[PDB]
Design a protein around this motif. Structure first.
Motif, PDB file in Angstrom:
ATOM      1  N   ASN A   1       1.027  -1.363   0.068  1.00 18.21           N
ATOM      2  CA  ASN A   1       0.030  -0.082  -0.072  1.00 18.21           C
ATOM      3  C   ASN A   1       0.711   1.390   0.047  1.00 18.21           C
ATOM      4  O   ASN A   1       1.970   1.283  -0.075  1.00 18.21           O
ATOM      5  N   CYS A   2       0.261   2.422   0.121  1.00 22.52           N
ATOM      6  CA  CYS A   2       0.918   3.632  -0.142  1.00 22.52           C
ATOM      7  C   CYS A   2       1.930   3.942   1.095  1.00 22.52           C
ATOM      8  O   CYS A   2       3.043   4.276   0.776  1.00 22.52           O
ATOM      9  N   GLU A   3       1.599   3.582   2.179  1.00 20.27           N
ATOM     10  CA  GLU A   3       2.423   3.873   3.421  1.00 20.27           C
ATOM     11  C   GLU A   3       3.589   2.697   3.545  1.00 20.27           C
ATOM     12  O   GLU A   3       4.724   3.231   3.805  1.00 20.27           O
ATOM     13  N   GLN A   4       3.440   1.535   2.858  1.00 21.11           N
ATOM     14  CA  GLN A   4       4.392   0.686   2.885  1.00 21.11           C
ATOM     15  C   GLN A   4       5.482   1.002   1.800  1.00 21.11           C
ATOM     16  O   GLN A   4       6.552   0.637   1.917  1.00 21.11           O
ATOM     17  N   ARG A   5       4.898   1.508   0.727  1.00 23.10           N
ATOM     18  CA  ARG A   5       6.205   1.850  -0.413  1.00 23.10           C
ATOM     19  C   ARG A   5       6.510   2.986  -0.060  1.00 23.10           C
ATOM     20  O   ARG A   5       7.780   3.062  -0.340  1.00 23.10           O
ATOM     21  N   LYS A   6       6.179   3.809   0.781  1.00 20.61           N
ATOM     22  CA  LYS A   6       6.907   5.022   1.378  1.00 20.61           C
ATOM     23  C   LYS A   6       8.104   4.613   2.233  1.00 20.61           C
ATOM     24  O   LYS A   6       9.242   5.281   2.077  1.00 20.61           O
ATOM     25  N   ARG A   7       7.680   3.621   3.233  1.00 21.03           N
ATOM     26  CA  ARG A   7       8.788   3.136   3.961  1.00 21.03           C
ATOM     27  C   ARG A   7       9.949   2.590   3.165  1.00 21.03           C
ATOM     28  O   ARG A   7      11.057   2.489   3.580  1.00 21.03           O
ATOM     29  N   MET A   8       9.556   1.817   2.068  1.00 24.59           N
ATOM     30  CA  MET A   8      10.520   1.123   1.425  1.00 24.59           C
ATOM     31  C   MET A   8      11.463   2.077   0.705  1.00 24.59           C
ATOM     32  O   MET A   8      12.842   1.781   0.465  1.00 24.59           O
ATOM     33  N   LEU A   9      10.805   3.222   0.248  1.00 26.37           N
ATOM     34  CA  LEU A   9      11.707   4.213  -0.544  1.00 26.37           C
ATOM     35  C   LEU A   9      12.694   4.840   0.339  1.00 26.37           C
ATOM     36  O   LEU A   9      13.706   5.443  -0.041  1.00 26.37           O
ATOM     37  N   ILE A  10      12.254   5.039   1.571  1.00 28.65           N
ATOM     38  CA  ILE A  10      13.412   5.725   2.652  1.00 28.65           C
ATOM     39  C   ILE A  10      14.404   4.777   2.836  1.00 28.65           C
ATOM     40  O   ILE A  10      15.636   5.326   2.845  1.00 28.65           O
ATOM     41  N   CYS A  11      14.046   3.248   2.873  1.00 20.14           N
ATOM     42  CA  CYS A  11      15.262   2.622   3.034  1.00 20.14           C
ATOM     43  C   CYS A  11      16.119   2.445   1.803  1.00 20.14           C
ATOM     44  O   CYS A  11      17.374   2.524   1.978  1.00 20.14           O
ATOM     45  N   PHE A  12      15.691   2.594   0.688  1.00 23.66           N
ATOM     46  CA  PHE A  12      16.384   2.547  -0.657  1.00 23.66           C
ATOM     47  C   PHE A  12      17.146   3.841  -0.533  1.00 23.66           C
ATOM     48  O   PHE A  12      18.264   4.161  -0.890  1.00 23.66           O
ATOM     49  N   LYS A  13      16.606   5.177  -0.205  1.00 26.39           N
ATOM     50  CA  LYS A  13      17.233   6.387  -0.276  1.00 26.39           C
ATOM     51  C   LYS A  13      18.446   6.370   0.846  1.00 26.39           C
ATOM     52  O   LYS A  13      19.607   6.782   0.409  1.00 26.39           O
ATOM     53  N   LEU A  14      18.261   5.972   2.011  1.00 28.72           N
ATOM     54  CA  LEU A  14      19.229   5.809   2.873  1.00 28.72           C
ATOM     55  C   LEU A  14      20.425   4.790   2.472  1.00 28.72           C
ATOM     56  O   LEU A  14      21.789   5.333   2.592  1.00 28.72           O
ATOM     57  N   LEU A  15      20.270   3.695   1.990  1.00 32.55           N
ATOM     58  CA  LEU A  15      21.159   2.849   1.326  1.00 32.55           C
ATOM     59  C   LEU A  15      21.860   3.692   0.312  1.00 32.55           C
ATOM     60  O   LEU A  15      23.037   3.534   0.267  1.00 32.55           O
ATOM     61  N   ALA A  16      21.190   4.351  -0.862  1.00 29.59           N
ATOM     62  CA  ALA A  16      21.851   4.835  -1.810  1.00 29.59           C
ATOM     63  C   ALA A  16      22.730   5.936  -1.559  1.00 29.59           C
ATOM     64  O   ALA A  16      23.878   6.054  -1.953  1.00 29.59           O
ATOM     65  N   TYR A  17      22.487   6.588  -0.522  1.00 29.65           N
ATOM     66  CA  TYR A  17      23.442   7.791  -0.040  1.00 29.65           C
ATOM     67  C   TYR A  17      24.532   7.278   0.846  1.00 29.65           C
ATOM     68  O   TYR A  17      25.553   7.861   1.073  1.00 29.65           O
TER      69      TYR A  17
END
Lengths: 249, 601, 298, 299, 298
Positions: free
Chosen positions: A129-145
């Motif tokens: 869902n929308c909330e689950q996707r946002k949390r995953m994108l946070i983890c991806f952004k943290l890893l990417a940086y």
């Protein structure tokens, strides 16, 4: 349950800094994912309800013993409330916080080779869902940086338009961005609607409802912190202060 | 649980984009061609072939001189392609015979077992019929491959031939002789972009038996598929004949490919076929467009599109990597349809790897669901309900090629003399089955000191009058060699003693339907067997009475079902060492006793 | 031997998995209830000679008062209902509507999102397969009343097998001329015009005599559990409105003539029980959409 | 000559002769009114999250306060209604409901039991007989919209006779290609696409050419007197529920796709004018049946 | 070349031109509103033991009180409604009702709406022409669901041209067997079962193989602006009653099976945009005629 109750970027990131990595992993063997199963849903049907097991359910599942499996378990814990079964990782890694694993080079884990396409595919993103996707994108952004792959993160978002529309806007090194963010990341909370004690057909929905009814019980229990009544009883270290910021940010 | 290391070790690999993966393949095909066909042997045998062709009584304007460089180069390409195609037809006829022997067990297999994969069904059928080859895997097909079925390699044939001989305003006899020795630059470019493909009957049985429920349907599907393949091969030889440079396949990839935004474009230009394929892979979306290789009046190579599957941008900018396909247009279209349907549950690496491996190495994907869908689409494209009307496109390709031949010759006849144009664009090399050609038979059966050389007479894609002849070279100074032609009613035995010279055996007439009347019965194919003591080489020659015999329409599924011809009689042999004078002639099977087809009894 | 199947039963596409929980189900129930009040506010306005009843109804539905310089759209609930319908049709459609917005809209009226307190009858006749021998032509036309045209050009009588699936409750067959039909391994009765049969019984054999063509008309009834607020007429109109507006326009999906065909086709999938619950919730959302858009065209 | 007829008009089974008096008509009317109140109370209960509206309606219906351990099926009124529905369908169905029960249940509400207040339109097209010569082939397919396919093989044009009965009020004929239709002993007009006919007017002759097949689509409308509470959408839904539940599994009976065909088929019998009155009563009972089961679900 | 068209699309007769102004439109709305109150009152009177609601409803509708001996004709409102329905159908109708009587009846109530406030979906499928080569045969049968049966007996595959007009929004094509369809002068795709098309995209070509016949089923949806009180179920039943009562028996007119066919046929004609305005008014009048007659049968 505690992780799923965080509603802001500040609270979610603060919780990840406090909690260690052992919470993300589970010591129950569980079953294997991507398996077609027949489950019993007697409130609705007499026959057995078909469904498919995934990594996003709140039940522990066996996971691969590699860095790919470790990251999938961390994101699963954030977006579902339970992790996977990856034992014998080592006490050096298990003591460190989830945030430190995600955005610090000192831990020793190497995550540069990770591809966001298969991780999103394996951590089934068409079923989130929308909330689950946002949390995953946070983890991806943290890893990417962490590994200096900001350009790859942007290209991945540009390929998938819906992910770009809901992608949180914050720079992992700056605390002002976390304060200004106003995304709603709560998967459990006090419901405005009428929440009943009834089952749901899907595995994901049934487990999510169990966490939701569990949070209501915990909200009204003695373990909850009512700030309006006992704000003078918390210690000074953990008291809410605007000057407070994440370490290294 | 698994670490995930074994999964990456069995992932398909890109065999076109990888320059290491392209060099290795090209070497093996070149080595395979040189081993089976040697440039030294073919060049040395040029004189022997030239005298054989001349000794055949051919009227003026209908005879070939291998003394001309262009005529010789065209002949070796023609002989290699015909030999591989001819060998496949004999293999198919044998396979049809075994199926007809065990029709009861085959019918049970086709009906009872339907949940198994196409490969599993084929393996069960091959085991029951007790065929010579019982392996459907890629390795098994490669292991059980004859010398003649090896695909011809373009650059190997064109290696070390003089190009660009210049004589100026000279009509002298010596200048003509030196002009004929060389070849034009256009033919060299065509040969450098030429590679042949000859599919095996074992590879065809999977599409044929994926929906069949009766032995007749399975046999009919096999015949229908091979009718299309032979027509495509005939187009391939005609393409090199005319004075035009053939296009060759290429892949376009980004100059600096990005990790997360990479696209691939494949342009397949099957030399044996009337249609081409354009496939684009952007993200997880696959788009294909089937175009017509004929027409192309403009500068762009692509003609009109006959089947659409999306929007393909052929004007993309990037590196260009060139390759030759080992699969037909039908096979390439079959896979790209299955990949499009299953694009959601496959990764980027699987999509690229599966596509490149099939096009470049004729390797079927290891996915079971992908393979089943591919063969279901392959059957549809070669059946009567195909989205592509093949007979229209193959016909239009024939007319386009003949038109190009006329305008190319007439353009040259203006620029140089008639003699110069004739030696550069021959008119006697129209089509693979239309042309006069030879088949270097090989033999591994010896009955009482007599080596048996088998030959398949027909089937015919053209109608008119045909002539067949044999050239036998034997170490002995005096020998007696026999030729036996087997039909349905009976066989015909002839005896000859002349050596080192072509000798006509059979005069045959074939009508519009492609069926001849052999001694009062309609036949579609015959078997010719030659028996020689201590033979060194036996060659069979074929020629049509008129040049450019008119075409016969290709036969579809219903055509094969309507008429049924028995092929069981091709198996029996005779023993010439025990022949008698009274046994030499045309006799039927009711004359002979059971099991002895040598003595009348 | 050839086989034939119904056109609408071929390749059902996967349905969405979002907006199925209790809060989202209550959002659809609230949207249906409030959109119904919007339509009835028109009749109240005629009787009351004023637009106040309509203004009250729209204010509750859109959280904003109507304006004369603005085209009435419905506000947040109209946007939420439209996007939620898109997600239901395909798994490739994004789930854009946040949960928090759904909970806020679900608190507007008191409802229970129980979608299993009633039933409905769906008339799409499922013909999974019809197996006929050689020299026999079989054509299946129609979805609500399926007409099967049968011709026997062979020398003798032929046996044709019918397979109506395992889901439909009853099927009634009416032939142009009296014909013989029996279950597998059963004797044939005298020729009759009409047969009533349960698809669960097994494949059915029909004897085709040589001569003029025989046409059989099939009508089936299936019971699917639906909420008490379900109305087939409104759902069917909502299906056509949504298809015209392009809410179903998304890649790699199938298109159906009616909601009757959509739900039955999904029910006959590999695991059709999983998709029936989502399809019914889509029906209630479509019923809300038809009422909302007819009152507020755009 | 060849004869073709619609399938649904062949051999209508006799209908029940019991529960047709004034007292029984009142019982069906009372049941329909109370069944409707039950379904409205079920909606109010869901909205208000209270069992008070449902308990009041169920008590008025079943005369028994709902209990947790037992099962709610409608009580004695449901038992009488279901078995009475069976009796209407066929003569072979038993009559098991006593008349002390019917009179007692008829007094639970005040309603006019008259079944001739209003009318309704039924769309089933009756084609009693189509007559064709030896050279032609005729096929009739359909109930709501009848499709007649005719092909002429003989040398000359053929005459086909259409008989639509005497009960249908209007019939509209449409052809794929223009065709010639006229009455008995009347001149043939120019070819037209659509004709409007009165079935009472007489047999109709269609001139069929020899070239191509002609498909004629027929649509009919007939008027049958029904009570003011009659609702076709509810009656049709009740008909399928009764068939699915097995209420119509009686020996030596005919089965129909919809209530449209059932009433029209019974109308065209020898004594159809008396059979339609019973069918209308069965229609009201089916509408009461539909509302009752939807309020009380049993899987 | 052979041309085949739908039967109901042939020669729409001219529609009447009177009683289409603002005052006359108000009268139809008032008649519909008053008739709805009449049928609702009749049901309540039957449910109850007293006849007050019907007495008031009939007095307002008919301008006189009901009597037990005289028959309930419906008053002058019923007479005016009957005659305007006749005038709307054809231009050859008399149309002799005074306009002053129409205005008097229109002042009984007031309506907060117009005839363009909402929309309705009409399911008739327009097939303007189907063009076929010399050897193929095409037959079109059906209005709600068109069924096009095409058979090829020539040497090779033929091309059939489909023209669905430019008015319908979406047309869904289903086939008995998979078939190929593409726009004019465009490459053909692989064979599929169902196609979704926009009729304004252009004429569509269908590949017809030689062999067993192909039957294509077409379903279309059209959007027409209607008042908010429009109800297709009530209009359709009112259409049948008007035909049975002989309100449409005028010389040189065409007869249609349903109001859906009537409105689509008028729309698919020259000056059809002006014709649908009068057909919508006639549709609302038929809604009042249905409700009035079911409450007061004669």
């Amino acid at each position: 349950m505690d992780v799923l109750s965080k509603g802001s970027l500040k609270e979610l990131l603060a919780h990840l800094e406090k909690t260690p990595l052992e919470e993300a992993i589970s010591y129950r063997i569980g079953t294997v994912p991507y398996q077609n199963v027949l489950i019993s849903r007697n409130e609705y049907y007499n026959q057995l309800y078909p469904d498919t097991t995934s990594l996003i359910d709140g039940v522990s599942r066996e996971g691969q013993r590699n860095v790919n499996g470790l990251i999938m378990s961390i994101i699963s814990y954030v977006v579902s409330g339970s992790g996977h079964y990856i034992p014998n990782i080592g006490f050096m890694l298990l003591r460190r916080s989830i945030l430190d694993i995600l955005t610090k080079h000192d831990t020793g884990l190497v995550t540069n080779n990770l591809n966001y396409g298969i991780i999103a595919r394996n951590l089934t993103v068409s079923k989130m869902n929308c909330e689950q996707r946002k949390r995953m994108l946070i983890c991806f952004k943290l890893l990417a940086y962490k590994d200096g792959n900001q350009n790859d993160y942007e290209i991945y978002l540009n390929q998938n338009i819906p992910l770009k529309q809901i992608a949180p806007n914050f720079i992992p090194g700056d605390m002002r961005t976390v304060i200004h963010n106003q995304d709603q990341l709560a998967i459990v909370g006090i419901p405005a609607y009428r929440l009943t004690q009834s089952t749901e057909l899907s595995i994901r929905d049934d487990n999510a409802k169990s966490y939701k009814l569990g949070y209501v019980d915990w909200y009204n229990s003695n373990s909850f912190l009512r700030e309006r009544s006992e704000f003078n009883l918390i210690r000074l270290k953990d008291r809410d202060t605007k000057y407070g910021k994440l370490n290294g940010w | 649980v698994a670490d995930g290391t074994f999964n990456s070790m069995i992932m398909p690999r890109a065999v076109i984009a990888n320059e290491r993966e392209h060099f290795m393949k090209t070497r093996i095909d070149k080595i395979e061609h040189d081993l089976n066909r040697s440039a030294k042997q073919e060049m040395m045998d040029r004189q022997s072939l030239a005298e054989d062709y001349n000794a055949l009584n051919l009227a003026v304007g209908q005879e070939i001189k291998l003394d001309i460089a262009t005529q010789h180069q065209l002949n070796r390409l023609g002989s290699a392609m015909y030999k591989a195609d001819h060998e496949r037809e004999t293999e198919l006829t044998d396979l049809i015979n075994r199926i007809r022997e065990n029709e009861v067990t085959v019918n049970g297999i086709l009906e009872n077992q339907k949940a198994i994969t196409a490969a599993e069904r084929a393996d069960l059928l091959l085991e029951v019929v007790a065929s010579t080859a019982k392996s459907v895997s890629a390795a098994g097909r490669a292991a059980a491959d004859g010398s003649g079925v090896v695909p011809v390699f373009g650059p190997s044939v064109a290696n070390g031939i003089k190009v660009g001989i210049d004589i100026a305003d000279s009509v002298a006899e010596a200048a003509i002789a030196v002009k004929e020795s060389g070849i034009i630059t256009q033919l060299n470019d065509v040969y450098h972009a030429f590679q042949s493909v000859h599919v095996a009957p074992n590879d065809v049985i999977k599409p044929a038996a994926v929906v069949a429920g009766t032995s007749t349907e399975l046999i009919g599907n096999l015949q229908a598929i091979y009718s299309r393949l032979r027509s495509h091969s005939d187009i391939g030889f005609k393409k090199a004949t005319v004075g035009d440079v053939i296009p060759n396949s290429y892949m376009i990839k980004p100059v600096n490919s990005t990790e997360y935004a990479s696209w691939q474009l494949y342009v397949i230009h099957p030399v044996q076929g009337s249609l081409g394929l354009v496939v684009q892979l952007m993200g997880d979306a696959l788009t294909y467009n089937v175009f017509a290789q004929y027409g192309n009046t403009s500068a762009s190579e692509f003609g009109k599109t006959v089947l659409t599957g999306g929007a393909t941008n052929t004007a993309l900018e990037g590196t260009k990597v060139k390759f030759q396909t080992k699969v037909t247009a039908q096979q390439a279209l079959a896979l790209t349809m299955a990949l499009k349907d299953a694009a959601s549950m496959l990764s980027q690496g699987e999509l690229i790897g599966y596509f490149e491996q099939y096009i470049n190495l004729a390797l079927e994907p290891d996915n079971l669901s992908l393979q089943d869908n591919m063969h279901k689409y392959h059957h549809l494209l070669t059946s009567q309900n195909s989205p592509i009307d093949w007979n229209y496109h193959d016909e239009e390709m024939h007319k386009w090629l003949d038109s190009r031949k006329t305008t190319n010759y007439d353009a040259m006849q203006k620029k140089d003399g008639t003699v110069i144009a004739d030696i550069h664009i021959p008119k006697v090399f129209n089509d693979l089955r239309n042309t006069t050609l030879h088949c270097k038979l090989e033999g591994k059966q010896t009955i009482a000191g007599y080596t048996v050389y088998e030959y398949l007479i027909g089937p015919w894609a053209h109608y008119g009058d045909i002539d067949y002849s044999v050239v036998v070279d034997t170490l002995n100074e005096e020998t007696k060699w026999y030729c036996e032609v087997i039909g349905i009613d009976g066989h015909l035995l002839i005896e000859k003693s002349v050596q080192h010279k072509p000798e006509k055996i059979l005069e045959l007439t074939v009508n519009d339907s492609g069926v001849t009347s052999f001694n009062g019965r309609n036949h579609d194919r015959l078997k010719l067997k030659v028996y020689v003591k201590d033979s060194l080489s036996v060659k069979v020659f074929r020629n049509w009475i008129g040049i450019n015999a008119p075409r016969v329409k290709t036969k579809m599924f219903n055509d094969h079902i309507g008429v049924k011809y028995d092929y069981s009689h091709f198996d029996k042999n005779i023993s010439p060492a025990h022949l008698t004078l009274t046994d030499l002639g045309w006799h039927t099977w009711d004359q002979y006793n059971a099991g002895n087809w040598t003595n009348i009894k | 031997a050839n086989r034939a199947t119904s056109a609408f039963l071929d390749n059902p596409h996967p349905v969405g998995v979002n907006y199925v929980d209790e809060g989202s189900r209550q959002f659809v129930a609230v949207a249906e209830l409030l959109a119904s009040k919007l339509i009835d506010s028109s009749r109240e306005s005629d009787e009351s000679n004023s637009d106040v009843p309509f203004v009250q109804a729209y204010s509750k539905f859109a959280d904003d008062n109507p304006r004369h310089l603005r085209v009435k759209t419905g506000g947040k609930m109209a946007n939420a209902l439209t996007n939620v319908i898109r997600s239901y049709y395909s798994i490739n459609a994004p789930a854009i509507v946040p949960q928090v917005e759904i909970d806020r809209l679900a608190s507007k009226a008191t409802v229970s999102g129980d979608m299993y307190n009633s039933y409905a009858i769906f008339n799409s006749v499922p013909i999974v397969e019809v197996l006929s021998p050689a020299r026999t032509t079989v054509s299946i036309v129609g979805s609500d009343r399926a007409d099967v045209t049968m011709l026997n050009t062979g020398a003798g009588a032929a046996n044709i097998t019918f397979n109506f699936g395992q889901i439909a409750e009853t099927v009634i067959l009416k032939g142009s001329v009296p014909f013989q039909l029996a279950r597998l391994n059963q004797p044939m009765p005298a020729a009759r015009f009409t047969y009533k049969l349960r698809p669960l019984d097994g494949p059915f054999i029909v004897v085709l005599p040589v001569g003029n063509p025989l046409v059989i008309s099939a009508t089936a009834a299936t019971r699917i559990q639906v909420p008490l607020a379900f109305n087939k007429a409104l759902v069917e109109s909502g299906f056509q409105t949504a298809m015209n507006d392009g809410l179903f326009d998304i890649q790699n999906v199938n298109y159906y003539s009616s909601f009757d065909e959509f739900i039955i086709s999904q029910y006959h999938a590999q695991d059709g029980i999983n998709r029936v619950s989502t399809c019914v919730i889509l029906g209630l959302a479509l019923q809300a959409y038809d009422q909302m858009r007819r009152a507020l065209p755009v």
